[PDB]
Amino acid sequence: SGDATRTLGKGSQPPGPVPEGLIRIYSMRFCPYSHRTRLVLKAKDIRHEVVNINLRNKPEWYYTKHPFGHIPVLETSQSQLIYESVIACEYLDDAYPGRKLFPYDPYERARQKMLLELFSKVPHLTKECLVALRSGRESTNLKAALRQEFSNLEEILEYQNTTFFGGTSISMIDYLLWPWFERLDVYGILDCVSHTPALRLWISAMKWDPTVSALLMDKSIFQGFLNLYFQNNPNAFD
Amino acid sequence: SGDATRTLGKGSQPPGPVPEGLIRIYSMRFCPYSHRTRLVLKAKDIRHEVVNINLRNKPEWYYTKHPFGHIPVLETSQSQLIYESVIACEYLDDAYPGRKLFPYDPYERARQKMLLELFSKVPHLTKECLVALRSGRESTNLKAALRQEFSNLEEILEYQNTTFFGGTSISMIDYLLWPWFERLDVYGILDCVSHTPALRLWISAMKWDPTVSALLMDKSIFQGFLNLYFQNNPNAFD
Ligand SMILES: *SC[C@H](NC(=O)CC[C@H](N)C(=O)O)C(=O)NCC(=O)O
Numbered sequence: 403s404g405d406a407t408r409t410l411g412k413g414s415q416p417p418g419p420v421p422e423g424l425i426r427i428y429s430m431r432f433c434p435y436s437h438r439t440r441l442v443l444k445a446k447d448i449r450h451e452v453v454n455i456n457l458r459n460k461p462e463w464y465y466t467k468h469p470f471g472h473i474p475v476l477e478t479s480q481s482q483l484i485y486e487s488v489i490a491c492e493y494l495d496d497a498y499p500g501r502k503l504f505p506y507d508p509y510e511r512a513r514q515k516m517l518l519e520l521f522s523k524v525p526h527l528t529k530e531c532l533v534a535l536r537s538g539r540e541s542t543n544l545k546a547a548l549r550q551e552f553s554n555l556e557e558i559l560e561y562q563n564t565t566f567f568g569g570t571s572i573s574m575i576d577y578l579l580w581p582w583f584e585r586l587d588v589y590g591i592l593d594c595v596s597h598t599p600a601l602r603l604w605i606s607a608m609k610w611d612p613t614v615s616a617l618l619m620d621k622s623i624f625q626g627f628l629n630l631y632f633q634n635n636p637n638a639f640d
Numbered sequence: 641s642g643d644a645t646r647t648l649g650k651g652s653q654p655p656g657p658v659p660e661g662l663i664r665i666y667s668m669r670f671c672p673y674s675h676r677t678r679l680v681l682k683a684k685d686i687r688h689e690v691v692n693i694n695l696r697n698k699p700e701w702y703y704t705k706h707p708f709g710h711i712p713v714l715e716t717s718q719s720q721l722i723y724e725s726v727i728a729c730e731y732l733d734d735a736y737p738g739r740k741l742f743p744y745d746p747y748e749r750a751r752q753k754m755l756l757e758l759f760s761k762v763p764h765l766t767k768e769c770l771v772a773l774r775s776g777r778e779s780t781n782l783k784a785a786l787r788q789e790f791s792n793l794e795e796i797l798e799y800q801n802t803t804f805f806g807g808t809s810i811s812m813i814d815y816l817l818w819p820w821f822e823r824l825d826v827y828g829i830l831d832c833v834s835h836t837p838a839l840r841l842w843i844s845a846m847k848w849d850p851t852v853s854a855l856l857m858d859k860s861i862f863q864g865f866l867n868l869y870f871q872n873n874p875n876a877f878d
Pocket residue numbers: 432433434435436457470471472473474485486487488
């Protein structure tokens with residue numbers, strides 16, 4: 403919600419300076435790391451501007467935002483740059499008022515970061531699973547590894563006996579995990595959660611969250627992206 | 641300072657419960673990750689107990705502190721477990737009063753975490769360098785890679801024109817990086833900072849810090865450790 407604009411690529415005008423009272427995020431519509439920070443921006447009700455970046459043909463000026471041209475990057479009114487999706491999310495939460503997403507209790511807050519670490523293998527595994535399916539490979543081994551990681555997550559929800567990873571209602575950790583879980587269906591690996599019932603309840607509960615729901619990707623647009631993407635078609639990155 | 645005790649290994653008595661008003665850290669005298677958390681414990685003047693763990697022959701009960709028996713682990717009076725050195729350090733800083741090690745400003749705090757990420761390749765590279773030297777390998781390539789990482793760090797200090805990574809005086813980020821820098825000499829890779837003058841000034845400045853100085857390892861004990869270690873001698877882990 404609010405990121406439906408053409409990407410800027412090589413030869414594009416850099417945006418103006420960030421206006422006072424706004425923060426800016428450099429994103430890309432299909433990037434799960436950027437998705438994570440956009441969820442936090444929305445959930446916290448932060449006034450912001452989304453600038454999409456062309457990852458195949460990056461604007462030369464974009465390397466002045468991140469030395470390797472990665473996304474997400476946050477850029478403030480005072481010229482300050484913040485990156486790593488997790489560092490970005492955490493900064494957003496501390497810097498801005500209203501709803502607090504991380505717990506106040508130091509221990510509870512640490513627990514969520516520990517849960518974040520337990521999840522660390524999932525992003526690259528889902529990616530490897532996708533790449534395998536998209537080349538026609540019998541990706542039984544990667545799926546088996548993903549299922550294990552998801553079993554590790556299931557045991558947390560199951561032990562805590564709460565709907566969300568951080569308790570009875572949604573919080574920071576839930577948004578941090580969300581984007582890869584949204585992608586399972588289109589990735590073709592929704593079956594990797596067939597054995598994890600609390601994860602499946604969590605997925606349902608997440609979709610009902612105002613913020614999660616507002617930012618849900620259109621499934622058919624996303625399928626088109628993946629087709630162009632795996633053909634290395636420049637149109638994917640627009 | 642305060643970690644000069646025999647390690648507990650297989651068949652060892654587990655320690656009692658953590659007494660009210662104390663936090664406990666599971667460590668090992670030569671572990672750089674644990675060293676990081678001990679520096680924070682000391683710097684914050686936190687009342688604590690250090691329990692050393694035998695990494696070659698782990699106590700069976702230790703898997704009830706960390707599922708893979710890693711260190712450091714913090715254990716509280718209320719039975720709570722916190723791990724990952726960085727998560728531990730961060731929790732310590734938020735939970736305990738007096739001197740604050742991370743900056744108060746959200747942006748400045750985020751910057752330090754960004755500096756921590758820039759440093760991320762250094763631990764395993766220094767380890768690979770050590771392993772290479774200790775088997776008699778012409779480790780020119782690993783040293784070249786380490787030197788690059790150290791050049792990346794030098795440019796930060798140089799751009800900021802301050803002694804410490806977080807400013808004119810010592811702070812959290814400095815303690816987080818410290819342990820690998822202490823180890824360069826005994827590792828045999830002190831020459832990998834020959835080209836980085838602010839890093840070398842920083843190293844000198846760090847050694848003068850009350851906390852850093854208090855926890856400095858004895859060089860000859862450490863050489864003995866490495867000899868036993870690379871011989872897979874059980875005595876290394878005592
Ligand atoms: S989704 C696009 C890529 N983003 C990242 O992999 C950021 C990961 C960070 N670790 C994080 O923010 O958490 C991306 O920037 N791809 C462009 C590239 O050239 O790598």
